[PDB]
Ligand binder design. Structure first.
Ligand code: ADP
Ligand code: ADP
Ligand code: MG
Ligand code: MG
Ligand code: MN
Ligand code: MN
Lengths: 374, 381, 368, 374
DNA sequence: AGTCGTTGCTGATTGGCGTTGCCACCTCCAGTCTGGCCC
DNA sequence: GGGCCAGACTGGAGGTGGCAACGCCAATCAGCAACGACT
């Protein structure tokens, strides 16, 4: 997956209709591009449009629908977001739009109008919310729950994977590796044990024994037990990526039922430590490396060719930030296009390609450069 | 010639975990008997044959049994795809039904055809048009809005209707044949399809509406509606199937045929006393099958475990309860009249009185509730 | 009088990511063409018509199209339900199928039918017997059912000079199985003895995907699938049997080769060996991409070796479907092995291990 | 509650014993002091040591006890943290220490030894863990869950109060304002109703009706209902504080059962919207204002005069960071003393006094200025 | 022959896990209005 | 000047989900009482 063009209209502080087309002259090199501007200018809104057009959700707002829509700018009657992406050499277009009744800002919100269509063929593939979501999840390999963890790293949620519950971590691992048969086995074992127990109200004790081993509703126990091998396979790639980002640390799987990743401190005579004890910047780098590995775990099936992350660089000093940027530049050689949100002057000076989200004082609105207007 | 106009069978629909197999089978048998009695030439099913893209096994069994038992009558049959059933699911049986005096259309572009009478002579020009999915008739392009795309879709569907009717007229030529038309879309006589955009066909048998009605006062454009009640909002209404007759190449008349009710249903309102009073009417009746009820208890802050009460009331009755609900929605929060009041100043009794004042209860229970509340403060001291 | 014997079509089977629609279509049209050429009197399909109990949309379209095209030929046809086929999926359309010179049997106990010739005269007795569910009727129960059913057909035939044919979807002693062959009667029967078949003039059987003469007698045969349904049988040509009868006795049996349209190959050895074996398709320009199973003999990570495998394949007109190592990944190990690794950490008492293993296996089978 | 002295010994990257006194020649003006240094140097470790000394717990580590102690430095057999704080004009001392068996860099973690004492006369007031926690909670007025919301803002958890669920916001408010009786009322009502029900009467019906109004287990419902006045007072104070911190926004409570706050964008003609739409920097400023309002709310019952901000200053741009620092300077001109940790280069010049922390050539340890060495 | 350091043996808390209800999104409609024209 | 007709909607219910507050049970933690462990 890679993003070809982004078109948005009246989202947050970005009043008006804006079209950002990559593969143009400034973005032809697939190099580093950074979105710069004051706080509250709408930088995150650019990344919110990409997530909105694809998965009908944005990281800040759980859902946007008829009942509620806090994403469209005030004193405006409509909003829309549309993205062009390319999977396996074929381009597709996703579209999400909503209009207020009678074109008046006080009117009630109407149902969204969604589409998914090939760019060159022009044929429409889906026109409903559920159909579009399922088809785009199948096509890209990753739905929203995997996009937000392996392709877009939102503000303040870089450590979501490490800090997530073991249940959520195992569920994400199954989603990426397509191994739900273990969860189904555990769930039906629990269901059959419950049925036998109610029929009681020598098979019952054996069913209870099997339930205590692998049985659980929605398959928690056996999912967690089975996903250890996937966790080790992910940890290998995580170490490979982290060696370039931050040479001090290495990752090693916890020896406990709740699947977790310990860390090895090579400077401290290879003394192993829990992952909770890492610093803020070290945890950010560990999470970034782990997410890159997570996107490299399914490279053979559905490769991901872009990465977006949001102001995670604020926790790094001038040297660790430089090492991380050298690693990101080296990874940019593979052809993965990286987009960064930041305010650090050093990296803003380093990166030459910028999308300046200029702010208009007093009004509360904002605008891009004139070349992106439409 | 004579044809029937029906649609919205919704075969295989599950209605609150219930199955409509017996009702659908009875309706299909009655329709076969009616066709035999009235000597009909064709039957038109305007979409929503199946309630889903992958109907269960018994829905397919019912469809197969109908299409095989129709062979005795010798009358033709036309089945069209709706917004519910799947184009591929209906196209599965296209060629196999082509040998069984049946034609099914699911995709666009299917050319007009001539319906033969019972003796084989050309009777009418069918001009079949199924539910036109947007993915079939338009090509998406970048740089449009939510309303502009809908405008393009409406223009395209109107153009499709006009061109297909022109082709049907070309096929008809000079022979006096009534050009019937078909569709499965919403009309209002905006996203709906205006009725004035329809071609001047001799008859238009539409679908997508479960209630029989005439559109724009034009008797030659009608919605046949569902033959069975598919929800509690239409339980008491009678259902009709149109019997259409043509003469000398022009429409003659439309007759409504009542579909007998197989599974009775009813809906009740009011408090528990009113529910008991309305349930009294079923005290001693032999009901085959038991009647299905929707109960809407009007809220007076009874706040009881009403499921058990309904189960006890309807236990001895020949009654099965599918759904019961209530309108209990209300917000619960304090309004600060002035900033000078803080939670330390106000007493517990004062806060409780503020809580109760937001409820519209009366002194018949306010005194007892206040006494009960004071008992709690008594037992902590 | 001639009869084409085929079975185990497995319509709608998803081979990994790929689908078998094109192969099945190019088989069905060829089968119709050969039926017309040999002016066969009937075509019999003994079991596993559909890969599963809820076939996809295109599989049913292929089946209906084949039945429709049968009418232009004029041959009678018979369908039987296999171990993977389900009642209320073949039996739901039975009534419509009758009008098209086709009889479909899924439930046991069906009375024997007289199979007409192309001229309308009787040709044989069919004895339609599908895959017999144990609940519908054990080794003796299969035998006496076959004997009783044959006896009923014998009474029906009387003294007329016609052959008697029998059907079945079951495993037999001396057969060779494959990975794609799903087992049946896991807890009650192991194999049916070939000597217990009633003395019918010919037997048509399915279930096994490999053509085999069983028991040593000619009048009992496995016809096998018409297309390769697993990677362990790619190189073996597939057969359809054109049996012939005359004067109430078997005349001869002939094998017809189904022309292969989808090349499939299996690779072996180390990465160095595979880098040379892949050169079989360098600049050959096979218009149907070849499906490959790569049995790499390395200990390197699968998710790392697949990258270089794809890199090598990108310059070739080939498409890899499966890669297996001959550390471990979850996509490799079997469910039984993974569950046993849980049992090992628990106490290793066999007295409970056997019961737990049986319970886990039956749970997994109920999922499947 | 003002931190006078801080003593720690072998915590995280700070090997050896150190003491920082906030009454020496530096910090005499009670002004801004900026703990500065590279990533993973022990900056966060200082605040973690303060929190550990006060409440036997750390923002990162859920509990430090006879087991799972991972705050102690590697290859070290003992660690301790001691602080001196002043409440109501008199100073106290808190002490927490743990040592390994046989004073080896391995072995069993011995049960920690804690104490609380007055500096006026040296009398030991509590030595048990539970008694020390209860006594320090009664003395200060702040439990851990209120200290970490008002005085110490960890990195990434500044918006914890804003994003907390209604239950754990109402529970915080009732304990902060000393209005806990409403929770006990709901608990008693629910217990009475359950006891009446289990016997199975019109009295049961009345109990059920009363329970539907205010009754709930753990006292959630009536507490949430009653704390509306407290939330309104708090949002009033927060708005008054925020007028000078960020002039664009105001704050008000919404008409919902959940205790929630909405912003009123004064620039866009007072258009009111939920806080979920706030930018990162705007949400940081709103959370800082809410924390200051939390401090001001109980100023008439127990006064807290210290504030520590771990991170989140990066989310702000230069043109906003200067205004935020000016507002912080205005607040610091009062009795409150505040300390800020950041890596941004702008704050290097504005704050003249710094508790510099430096690592040592990759040895894995770190040391701060020798003037703080014991 | 005196002092201490370490280790089991008991109450409390408490946090995941399952349970029973209880709220958010689609797809077909009857109720609600509001302005213009002619007698 | 009033009654009738024609536009223009519209929120709303039967299915699907997710989550919220409980009740429960296994796990954990803080005091005690020995018990050993040194000079
Ligand atoms: N519905 C809305 N109407 C108008 N402005 C909005 C709306 N929702 C959010 N905003 C504002 O839009 C801006 C978006 O900025 P954002 O992209 O979050 O900035 P940053 O990149 O610094 O995090 C903020 O000022 C936010 O408050
Ligand atoms: N038990 C431990 N022993 C030694 N070092 C540790 C231990 N736990 C954490 N550390 C290290 O101590 C350092 C603490 O840095 P921290 O104060 O979090 O940095 P920052 O202020 O940049 O967030 C990190 O390098 C961390 O990995
Ligand atoms: Mg930190
Ligand atoms: Mg942001
Ligand atoms: Mn088989
Ligand atoms: Mn088979």
């Amino acid at each position: 997956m890679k993003i070809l063009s982004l078109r948005l209209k009246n989202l947050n502080s970005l009043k008006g209709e804006w079209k950002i087309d990559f593969t143009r002259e400034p973005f032809a090199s697939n190099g580093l591009f950074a979105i710069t501007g004051p706080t509250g200018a709408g930088k995150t809104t650019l990344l919110d449009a990409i997530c909105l057009a694809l998965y009908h959700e944005t990281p800040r707002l759980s859902n946007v629908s008829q009942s509620q829509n806090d994403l469209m700018t005030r004193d405006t009657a409509e909003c829309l977001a549309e993205v062009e992406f390319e999977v396996k050499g074929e381009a597709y277009r996703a579209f999400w739009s909503q209009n207020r009744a009678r074109n008046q800002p006080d009117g009630n919100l109407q149902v969204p109008r969604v589409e998914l269509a090939r760019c060159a063929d022009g044929k429409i593939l889906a026109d409903k919310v559920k159909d579009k979501l399922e088809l785009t999840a199948t096509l890209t390999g990753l739905d929203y729950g995997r996009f937000t963890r392996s392709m877009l790293l939102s503000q303040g949620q870089f450590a979501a994977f490490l800090n997530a519950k073991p249940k959520e971590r195992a569920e994400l691992l199954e989603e990426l590796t397509g191994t739900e048969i273990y969860g189904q086995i555990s769930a039906m074992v629990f269901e059959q044990h419950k049925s036998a127990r109610t029929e009681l109200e020598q098979q019952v004790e054996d069913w209870g024994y099997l339930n205590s081993l692998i049985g659980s509703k929605e398959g928690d126990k056996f999912r967690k037990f089975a996903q250890g091998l996937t966790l080790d396979n992910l940890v290998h790639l995580a170490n490979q990526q982290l060696t370039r980002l931050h040479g001090r640390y290495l990752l090693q799987r916890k020896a406990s039922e709740a699947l977790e990743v310990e860390v090895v401190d090579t400077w401290q005579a290879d003394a192993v430590r829990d992952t909770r004890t890492l610093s803020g910047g070290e945890s950010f780098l560990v999470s970034l490396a782990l997410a890159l590995a997570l996107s490299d775990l399914v490279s053979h099936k559905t490769r991901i060719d872009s990465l977006f992350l949001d102001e995670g660089f604020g926790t790094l000093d001038s040297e660790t930030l430089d090492t991380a940027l050298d690693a990101l530049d080296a990874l940019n050689a593979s052809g993965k296009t990286i987009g960064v949100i930041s305010h650090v002057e050093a990296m803003k000076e380093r990166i030459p390609v910028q999308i300046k989200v200029k702010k208009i004082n007093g009004l509360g609105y904002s605008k891009l450069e004139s070349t992106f207007a439409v | 010639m004579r044809i029937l106009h029906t649609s919205d069978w919704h075969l295989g629909q599950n209605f609150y975990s219930k199955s409509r197999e017996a009702e659908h089978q009875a309706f299909l048998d009655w329709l076969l008997e009616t066709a035999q009695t009235h000597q009909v030439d064709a039957i038109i099913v305007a979409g929503d044959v199946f309630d889903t893209g992958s109907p269960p096994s018994y829905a397919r069994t019912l469809y197969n049994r109908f299409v095989v038992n129709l062979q005795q009558t010798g009358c033709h049959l036309v089945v069209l795809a709706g917004n519910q059933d799947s184009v591929a699911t209906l196209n599965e049986s296209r060629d196999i039904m082509a040998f069984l005096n049946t034609t099914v259309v699911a995709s666009a572009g299917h050319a007009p055809q001539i319906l033969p009478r019972r003796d084989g002579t050309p009777g009418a020009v069918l001009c079949p048009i199924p539910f036109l999915r947007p993915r079939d008739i338009i090509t998406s392009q970048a740089g449009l809005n939510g309303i502009e795309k809908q405008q393009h879709l409406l223009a395209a569907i109107t153009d499709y209707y006009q061109q297909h009717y022109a082709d049907a007229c070309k096929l008809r030529g000079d022979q006096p044949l009534p050009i019937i038309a078909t569709g499965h879309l919403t009309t209002v006589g905006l996203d709906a399809f205006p009725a004035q955009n329809f071609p001047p066909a001799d008859y238009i048998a539409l679908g997508h509406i479960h209630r029989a009605q005439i559109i724009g006062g034009m008797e030659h454009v009608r919605y046949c509606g569902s033959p069975i009640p598919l929800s509690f909002d239409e339980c008491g209404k009678s259902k009709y199937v149109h019997l259409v007759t043509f003469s000398n190449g022009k429409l003659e008349s439309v007759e409504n045929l009542n579909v007998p009710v197989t599974q009775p249903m009813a809906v009740l309102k009011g408090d528990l006393a009113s529910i008991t009073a309305q349930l009294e009417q079923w005290r001693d009746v032999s009901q085959e099958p038991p009647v299905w009820l929707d109960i809407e208890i009007t809220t007076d802050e009874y706040l009881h475990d009403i499921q058990r009460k309904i189960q006890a009331l309807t236990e001895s009755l020949p009654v099965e309860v599918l759904l019961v609900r209530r309108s209990r929605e209300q917000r619960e929060r304090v309004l600060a009249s002035q900033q000078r009041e803080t939670l330390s100043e106000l007493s517990v009794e004062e806060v409780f009185n503020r809580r109760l004042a937001l409820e519209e209860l009366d002194e018949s229970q306010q005194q007892r509730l206040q006494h009960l509340f004071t008992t709690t403060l008594h037992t902590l001291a």
